[PDB]
Structure 1
Amino acid sequence: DNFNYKNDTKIIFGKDNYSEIGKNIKIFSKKTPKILLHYEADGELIKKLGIYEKVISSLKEFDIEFIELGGVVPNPRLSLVYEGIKICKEENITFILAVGGASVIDSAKAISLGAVDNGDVWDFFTAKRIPQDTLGIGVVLTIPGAGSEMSESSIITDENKKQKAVCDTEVNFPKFAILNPEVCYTIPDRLMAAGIVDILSHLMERYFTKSIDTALSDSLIEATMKIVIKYGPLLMKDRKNYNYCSQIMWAATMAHNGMIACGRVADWASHRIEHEISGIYDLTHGIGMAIIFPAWMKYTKNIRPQIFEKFFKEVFNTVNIDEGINKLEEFFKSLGINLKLSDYGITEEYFSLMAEKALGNSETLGRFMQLNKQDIINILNLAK
């Protein structure tokens, strides 16, 4: 149970600090800076929220020239990376400012790769060549989900082949990421609640593990989880509260940190099951992770019951798995979330279809518990 850890992304955390955009562009861009401002669509949100302008007022404040590129799709297209690469070689862009969420942060990362490369950028997603440099990006995050602002991955889709892929390498690490919890305020309720689940789930998938000798790390993952459990409901009912937003945003960041999860095997079973509820139904990840995970832990409560007893003792102050599973259920409902799939008029109709697609060509699925097709149907019946 050894492990390595790197993460060089600079964290600029806090509020009323919009100068550090400029400052940090100067610090990690060569020569004189000239940047690309990247965002989903035509600035429609970042502008409506007032980030756009205060962004611009930072660049002006620092004599930073800049072209803009827009038109990002929620799952972004190499269509537009080929666009942005042309522009960074054409206009000698020396640095890119991702303003938005993970799917512009993703597109930004892939432009930063090709801006510096001689060949085609797919070869870096194709598993053909391993990029050895990028220009470098700074992110201004508007929504604390998934942590692409601090990761080494980029998730793009080739729509004319519509084969999607990813590229995972230490070059993709942002040079810096601005994190202001104020951006949490304008987020809609059901989307805020699902992002609080994503954080807890990210933590639980690493926590529930067959690994041993993990006490310290157990403690840290417990601490973050417990904070998500305490504050998530408060933020839900006090959306503009900077403190509440700071604990939550900071929790999501730490959840994405391999210092606290350090040499322990993550189980992705709940993720994959949910992936296929979301493939056939219009349903938000986080909401599906609140209906499935309790189903899954109910079905896996016999593998290492001790590590379940521990979980619920540390986090819900109780040694009975049943009582604690229900407290976790109750905590999900305290963020607006109905706990069953029937409640979303999802029926048993495609449980079979979903279970086959989840397993694909494998026979089982999972690490904590190896789960086969009928196992998965049982879990879906538990969550019905």
Structure 2
Amino acid sequence: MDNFNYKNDTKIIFGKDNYSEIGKNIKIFSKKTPKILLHYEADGELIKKLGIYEKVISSLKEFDIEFIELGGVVPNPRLSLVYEGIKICKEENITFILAVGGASVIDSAKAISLGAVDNGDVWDFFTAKRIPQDTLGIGVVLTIPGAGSEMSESSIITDENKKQKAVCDTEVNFPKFAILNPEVCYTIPDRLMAAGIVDILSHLMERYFTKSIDTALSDSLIEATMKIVIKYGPLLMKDRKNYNYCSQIMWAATMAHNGMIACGRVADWASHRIEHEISGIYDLTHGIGMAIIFPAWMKYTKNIRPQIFEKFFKEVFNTVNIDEGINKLEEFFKSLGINLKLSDYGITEEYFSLMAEKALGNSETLGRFMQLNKQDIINILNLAK
């Protein structure tokens, strides 16, 4: 019964053996004669080794696109490099940016696209001083499936001088196009691919367990997507170069980041916030943490709205029994290679209380589906210990 609005203008170009689409789509979206800035991480090493670089260069030649290269993106993209990109755009009369890589290259490209067309300081857009109203325009070649910035309206940039991270969220940030080829999955190492599967399922699950009502169709779409991740994830884990398996998983990621299927329901970020503190202290991959934390949060919140738990486990795991369902969900994680206890990762109870306080910050509780105070979070951590 919750009203909602939905919009996503990013053109999705899904599939393989279609590298000509790069220059074709640059022409569709660049203003007059294309002259583009090629943006990537470090000096190309990864994308060059994977053969993506030579493929991009050949699509640019095949359409007579003049291009300048700006490398140097760092996993947490720096305003230092953004500022440099604005200059190169203004001086060299760049018409369009092509981000080749992942969330760091994409977000760097988004902030360069913002400043290139602006007569002030781009950090005003990130620090709530000004509201951007235009962007040069970017396209993305996605190399590693992640949080979906290739179709989001958010850019996250860190100012290393003040050591301050800021976000700019606005419609103009939507990439004009996003090339998605499942083949980029083939080379991701097993552990990180298992983690990324958990991230897709975590992202849907956080929207599913909701106190919103009248979401029958939304429920079914989210169930259908979660079920695919549960069925195909283990198959992909054992057959890494299977195109069908990678397509299903990467289209499920897309469908999860898109939110047409999640429209009209309130998400809960408790497990994400608790996991964040584990990762902030220990070297734990996000997906590995969510596989550990989410079953524990499910057990602790099983009494809030038991019927929505019964529906989830009936629709996704064909069982109305919550405890058997939870065990099935835990077996599914173990089938991707992930150990389920924090102690398995050498994490002891030592910092549970500190983790809970950090997650809580200046509030007494965290969560929406269930409000969690300090001891509640410690109890969830003990369930996962």
TM-score, normalised to structure 1, is 1.00
d(CA) in 2 for partners of 1:241, 1:210: 38
Q: Which SS does the other structure have where 2:172 is aligned?
A: coil
d(CA) in 1 for partners of 2:162, 2:232: 44
How far has the Cα of 1:144 moved from its partner? 1.3
d(CA) in 2 for partners of 1:312, 1:229: 12
d(CA) in 2 for partners of 1:202, 1:318: 22
State the match for 1:267 in structure 2.
268
- Deviation by residue 1:280-322 (Cα, 9 ceiling, x = unmatched): 0011101000000000000000000000000000000000000
- Deviation by residue 1:50-95 (Cα, 9 ceiling, x = unmatched): 0000100000000000000111111111011001111100101110
How far has the Cα of 1:140 moved from its partner? 0.3
How far has the Cα of 1:343 moved from its partner? 0.3
Q: Which SS does the other structure have where 1:204 is aligned?
A: helix
State the match for 2:139 in structure 1.
138
How far has the Cα of 1:117 moved from its partner? 0.5
Q: Which SS does the other structure have where 1:364 is aligned?
A: coil
Q: Which runs of 5+ in 1 are unaligned?
A: none
d(CA) in 2 for partners of 1:105, 1:283: 24
State the match for 1:301 in structure 2.
302
- Deviation by residue 1:87-113 (Cα, 9 ceiling, x = unmatched): 100101110000000111011100000
How far has the Cα of 1:2 moved from its partner? 0.3
d(CA) in 2 for partners of 1:56, 1:302: 56
Q: Within the alignment, does 1:172 sit opposite 2:167 as a pair?
A: no
d(CA) in 1 for partners of 2:142, 2:87: 25
- Deviation by residue 1:38-58 (Cα, 9 ceiling, x = unmatched): 111000100000000010000
- Deviation by residue 1:91-139 (Cα, 9 ceiling, x = unmatched): 0111000000011101110000000011000000000100000000000
- Deviation by residue 1:237-284 (Cα, 9 ceiling, x = unmatched): 000000000000000000011210011000000000000000000111
d(CA) in 1 for partners of 2:345, 2:259: 35
Q: Which SS does the other structure have where 2:69 is aligned?
A: strand
d(CA) in 2 for partners of 1:236, 1:364: 37
Q: Which SS does the other structure have where 1:331 is aligned?
A: helix
d(CA) in 2 for partners of 1:29, 1:116: 13
Q: Which runs of 5+ in 2 are unaligned?
A: none
Q: Within the alignment, does 1:55 sit opposite 2:56 as a pair?
A: yes
State the match for 1:115 in structure 2.
116
- Deviation by residue 1:324-370 (Cα, 9 ceiling, x = unmatched): 00000000000010001100000100000000000100110000000
Q: Which SS does the other structure have where 2:258 is aligned?
A: coil
* Divergent runs of 4+, >2 A: none
How far has the Cα of 1:31 moved from its partner? 1.0
Q: Which SS does the other structure have where 2:97 is aligned?
A: strand
d(CA) in 1 for partners of 2:81, 2:67: 18
- Deviation by residue 1:166-191 (Cα, 9 ceiling, x = unmatched): 01000000000000000000100000
Q: Which SS does the other structure have where 1:377 is aligned?
A: helix
Q: How does 1:1-384 map to 2 (within 5 A)?
A: 1-384=2-385
d(CA) in 2 for partners of 1:277, 1:169: 30
Q: Which SS does the other structure have where 2:332 is aligned?
A: helix
- Deviation by residue 1:181-228 (Cα, 9 ceiling, x = unmatched): 000001000000000000000000000000000000000000000000
d(CA) in 2 for partners of 1:322, 1:275: 26
d(CA) in 2 for partners of 1:118, 1:262: 37
d(CA) in 2 for partners of 1:165, 1:327: 39
d(CA) in 2 for partners of 1:93, 1:232: 41
d(CA) in 2 for partners of 1:103, 1:372: 34
d(CA) in 2 for partners of 1:381, 1:45: 40
How far has the Cα of 1:143 moved from its partner? 1.1
d(CA) in 1 for partners of 2:302, 2:112: 45
CA RMSD of aligned residues (A): 0.4
d(CA) in 2 for partners of 1:186, 1:258: 28
d(CA) in 1 for partners of 2:322, 2:43: 49
Q: Which SS does the other structure have where 2:9 is aligned?
A: coil
> How many corresponding residue pairs?
384
TM-score, normalised to structure 2, is 0.99
d(CA) in 2 for partners of 1:129, 1:238: 49
